[model samples]
Target chain A: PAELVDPKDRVQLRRVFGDFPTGVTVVTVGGSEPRGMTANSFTSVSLSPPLVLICVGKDAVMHQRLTALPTFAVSVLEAGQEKAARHFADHSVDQFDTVDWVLGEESGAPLIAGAVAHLECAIHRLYEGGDHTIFLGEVITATRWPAREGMLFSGGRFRRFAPDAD
Target chain B: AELVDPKDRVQLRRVFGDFPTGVTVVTVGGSEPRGMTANSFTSVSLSPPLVLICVGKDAVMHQRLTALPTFAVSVLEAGQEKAARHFADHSVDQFDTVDWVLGEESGAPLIAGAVAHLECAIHRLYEGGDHTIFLGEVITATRWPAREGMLFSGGRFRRFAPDAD
Candidate 1:
């Protein structure tokens, strides 16, 4: 049995958490000035009422945008969109200036083109989570692209699912 | 662009099926310890050591967690599919067949042979439709060097493969 320790070291804590693999997503809030950011912290919250949640840094521009817009879109990236993920993750002057996307019909939030899936949601609630805020959203609309492999993030880098080794 | 009707329960649920997630078994204290398998686990914050997991409102573990102050999250490693399946099914005694130890501070059940273990104190709870989202402040955490992790995606269990550089 492993002994528990207070992982006060942020780096080690991050490394340990990095072992858990997750799909990559770009959360976007559209308006006169659309804001978007790459995040792996998105997850489904509930089946009834269709809830989903994503964590955003309190200091991020998207956080402020979401606070006012109340509507947002989540685009789950496919394995081939690593460049788009990198583009949205950086501190660019205009994140969407070069990205190909369109506003969702319902939420009006920008949905990234070629994403494996997309969900448009309305902010249901927000909870203070230390340096980040948990945005729980009620999914109003959703779409799934044809079956395709999703991009995996783990071990502090983009990874691919192991091929079936049977 | 194909728009999915939220009213279409089958299609709506399938939209999230493509997103990959890690598997975890959450354990809480009681006269008889309670545990359940959940994939809705994700990291929320780092500065204050926060993580979140969702529990169905009707689950027995949800009632147990509501009365407990702390719990443990064991990130299941590869080859632990049996453990995952065992806890997912509510028909059997989940802890009776598995190896676990009690945490020193929280007295929560820490599952053995997991990739990582996080003992947390419940920080807050928020209504999430038919489920409740439990945000926990991690009090203590430990990790095993073995990196293999159990993955769930497209409604199936998967194995992790390191990217070939």
Candidate 2:
């Protein structure tokens, strides 16, 4: 079973994280270094003024661009976009050429096409988390394509939802 | 799953809701112990180690959490649906109603059977639309790495079975 992907003898923090299954998302931003970063740490913060957030590694290139710019995008990848998921997670590659995407008018961020949901946002605030920074973005606009299902990362692997009707 | 019109604000929330997430109860320790069920928890970085959870401004835990410098999180296992509900509802004596013990680091009540526990310092607090984002630095963490977890999606708690192929 692919080396029985158990969260043991690994970094305790990452090991523990395996128990908390989370959906996959590709956080994007535009400019000289246009990029798509795979993140499972995205969260819906508030509904009043429309807000959302994603944690970016302090050392990541995406982190510098986000810090330099005020706008970003979030594409909540659906069930069939693992290729996009794997592709975006790789920092060494030129991402845009391989993935289907377009630019958001409100925020000018790259929105991955075929995503289950898309959120174009303006950076509202930022905070420190040990080695990462929290980008609190006030969503300017959001869209969802209902036909696709959500995909997840858990137990050290990509995962599909359990049957909804059974 | 029910359909949500993308343009509808209220329904747009359901579209966000459709995404499955792990269920957790964010807790703060003190004279008045406060707890709230959340699927908003996320692991942020590993360098120095960090995590975060969003709290609704209206929830009782919001004030308590933000006012304090320390809090803990209990990631529920698959069998603890009742614990999840008890924490989510504000009426009952939540901690009294559940099996728990004060944590070693944050001193918050940790649900007895959670798959994982995190004791964090309120690294930072930022305003989120109608909520407050609690960015945390994990001072100490507890985890049952191989245990199963409950999945929250579509406004209901469901079984978690990650398909790896």
Candidate 3:
């Protein structure tokens, strides 16, 4: 059935994407300055070579800093870390002063402490993504913390998964 | 302590599972229609209305998605675990196990009662070892009123809490 002809408006299009909930993550790069940003546009693309992908908007300020430091780290934000998620969103704010983190062994990029998991990776491929750029990260080191409740994103807000949902 | 890991495949799977994601069924039509349950779907860009889904090369549906120029996605909602399992299984005809209606634009089947649906064109295919990343430019996007959708994490099917923060 034809539910919709076209989502001509970007607002409506974003609303449609919001129907798919996702986990929150912070992508970080270390060097000239402690750089980090929150993102939910992440997915495990391939496992054979241990790869993951995240989208960074071309116009997003994180794009340039991230592009320069090909090696980076991903902090999988879990429940109770909503503060970190909010912390990274404010571009000008120096997040390092607020969030506790350490330089990852592989990439030497700062990885937020107390996360569900951390992945150190180097850029493997880049592709044009409309107004965004797709970064294919070849995972070098992957480490997991104790299993914990996940922090979710959807409906344009941070959410928590029901403990009993199945 | 919870299961921590080195870079072995099994451990890596568990590592990434630490990051939860929503489940979706990617469908495409022809003489033989196809469907796949993918938690690897994510939005890429908002302006061109782009999204992406990663399909393992080994999956039967991967070939169909790669061959077709157009496809559709049905974002699963609560109580649709059965449909999720049906689409992921390879033993039977996928379309036969689920209730769906053909997308008007792509003619690909959209799951009945799904929380949302989208028709898209395969804008690009990026190689990612054993999986192919299908980047789609959305043609039409629509959704139902359901406020919550299915959650796939900790290697299990889950759902969202009633309220948002």
Highest DockQ against the true fold, candidate:
1
Residue A54, model 2: Cα distance from true site in angstroms: 1.0
> lDDT values of the candidates?
0.84, 0.79, 0.84
Candidate 1: deviation at residue A159, Å?
0.8
Model 1: lDDT of residue B85: 92
Q: For model 1, name the residue pairs that clash.
A: none
Candidate RMSDs in Å, in order, are: 1.9, 4.0, 2.0
TM-score ranking from best to worst? 3, 1, 2
Model 3 vs. true fold: TM? 0.94
lDDT of 3 by residue, B1-165 (tens): 243344588888888888988899999988888888989988888778899999899888788887888999999987899999988777736677678999888889999878798899998988987899999989886788554688898889987777843
Cα lDDT tens digits, model 1, A11-88, are: 877977786779999999878898789999999877778889999999999888988987999999988889989998
Candidates' TM-scores?
A: 0.94, 0.88, 0.94
**Where does candidate 3 clash, by residue pair?**
none
For B5-33, candidate 1 gives per-residue lDDT tens digits of 77676776778777888899998876787
Instruction: Judging by DockQ, tell me the better candidate of 2 and 3.
Output: 3
lDDT (tens digit, per residue) of candidate 2 on B1-165: 344343466876876775669899888888888888999998887766667788888888888987888999888998899999988776735677889999878989998888888788887777776787777877777677667788887677777555556
lDDT of 1 at A3: 40
Off by over 4 Å in 3: A1-5, B1-6
